[PDB]
Write a protein that binds this ligand. Structure first.
Ligand code: HEM
Ligand code: HEM
Lengths: 256, 255
């Protein structure tokens, strides 16, 4: 009722990555998504499949495709495709990114950089060396996003190839998994106090979602309402240990 | 060798026919990935997440907002596909792709279609907003693939007529409550049944889904995870009969 307007005022103000930096960063941390192609076998229809991928240094998704797969034959007959990424694949209100582009076979000089980028995200994918597997790269044309579907907070927009490639991946997001886990399972009481302090909302619960150099996001519950809150750090975190120090300081501040 | 012992059991175990399995999984699914032709970016396909509900013929019903990108895609070109993953995070699971043509629902059909959708999305009050409409994807062809990166690889396709003629398994609707109550309160009962019927000593056995002929489990031995089909000694007739059959299979397991 009145808190849903208090949330809006906090969300509009809290420090966060710029839109293009957020999309570049979420894409770089994702490893799987839904590929849309033109169906080669069912002429006139599009087609979807689940694929693993890894962004190369430029942010271009790298795919390891079997010559036996339906989507591979699709891509060889028509390279124009799209890749749909969901930050939380079952969060109906999450960020959703669609990257449209053109699948191209990776050149021989690029095989080594591409193999390492892919294995960095899929360390047990020994099959990438099999003869029937090749690496393909989706060269972006446009990257579109939508977030907060079925909520008051809806954001959307698109970035050109040049805008997306020029953005830097946030160097702190890579530490997201260990920090959020250790905090959600052992210090969930600290998270709510910090959230309580900085948004003035008494939160029944608060689970850390993701993390970047400017702060972290949480899923919070009050009454029969669940919603997301941005928790900015008092200053930009410079490395992993710095993330830990900043949370301690923010906890200390709430005990005052 | 286990990976040959399990395979022999999987090849024999009673299970739904392929078309009945796909018809049943699709009818139990409520969300998926919609591929359309992009209206704004000519020549490219486009993807988005949608909620849906199958109507009685198995046709996915969508409630789409006129504000949404995929709606504008569908209004310019109704050809689309809907990708469903039975276990959305299992990379080796069954994956179903239904290709077809999205069509506006008639005024005579609004009420039946609205109820089929709300049966799967009971709190979706927004379907009554003015900018929302029901669309139905009329299937052309339904394709499936299962077991990517496993020994068990299955694939095939079904025409519209073949898919529509198949019946949804009437026992699968009870899968969620039955599997839950068994997984957290009687996982030891499940392990005895699986061991008895496959002779595999399993560290664990987790029920995944259920149908009138039996249920599937995720099982572990050593550092290996795999799926095993556990058929009933006979077809189950209703929910209580599912309970009745599981007791008997456990009783048999003591011996
Ligand atoms: C309680 C409030 C709201 C609810 C329950 C709600 C519900 C939904 C749902 C279910 C969809 C999915 C439509 C589809 O898949 O076709 C949607 C999409 C959308 N909504 Fe809302 N909505 C709410 C508030 C808002 C507000 C406040 C705005 C704008 C100020 C908005 C703008 C949009 C847009 C642009 C989309 C389309 C996104 C796309 O292209 O896929 N909504 N909403
Ligand atoms: C006789 C043995 C096998 C057969 C007949 C087979 C069959 C297939 C088929 C038909 C596909 C196409 C997927 C699609 O159409 O979307 C595929 C893809 C794939 N297979 Fe196999 N498979 C076998 C063994 C294996 C094994 C043992 C592994 C891993 C240990 C494996 C890993 C994969 C992967 C990762 C993909 C996905 C590649 C892509 O998405 O392009 N395969 N396989």
């Amino acid at each position: 009722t009145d808190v849903f307007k208090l949330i809006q005022a906090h969300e509009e103000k809290a420090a966060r990555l710029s839109p293009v930096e957020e999309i570049r960063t979420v894409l770089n941390g994702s490893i799987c998504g839904m590929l849309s192609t033109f169906s080669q076998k069912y002429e006139g229809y599009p087609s979807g499949s689940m694929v693993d991928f890894a962004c190369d240094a430029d942010g271009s998704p790298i795919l390891a495709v079997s010559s036996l797969a339906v989507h591979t034959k699709d891509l060889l007959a028509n390279p124009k495709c799209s890749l749909l990424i969901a930050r939380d694949p079952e969060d109906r209100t999450g960020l959703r990114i669609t990257l449209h582009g053109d699948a191209v076979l990776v050149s021989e000089k690029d095989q080594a950089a591409v193999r390492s980028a892919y294995l960095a995200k899929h360390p047990k994918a020994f099959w990438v060396d099999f003869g029937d597997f090749s690496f393909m790269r989706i060269e972006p044309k446009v990257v579109r996003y939508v977030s907060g579907v079925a909520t008051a907070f809806l954001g959307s927009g698109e970035f050109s190839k040049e805008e997306y490639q020029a953005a830097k991946v946030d160097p702190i997001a890579q530490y997201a998994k260990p920090v959020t886990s250790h905090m959600n399972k052992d210090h969930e009481e600290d998270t709510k106090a910090i959230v309580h302090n900085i948004t003035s909302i008494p939160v029944e619960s608060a689970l850390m979602l993701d993390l970047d150099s400017l702060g972290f996001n949480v899923k919070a519950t009050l009454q029969g309402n669940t919603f997301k809150l941005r928790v900015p750090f008092p200053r930009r975190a410079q490395d992993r240990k710095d993330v830990k120090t900043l949370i301690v300081e923010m906890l200390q501040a709430a005990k005052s």
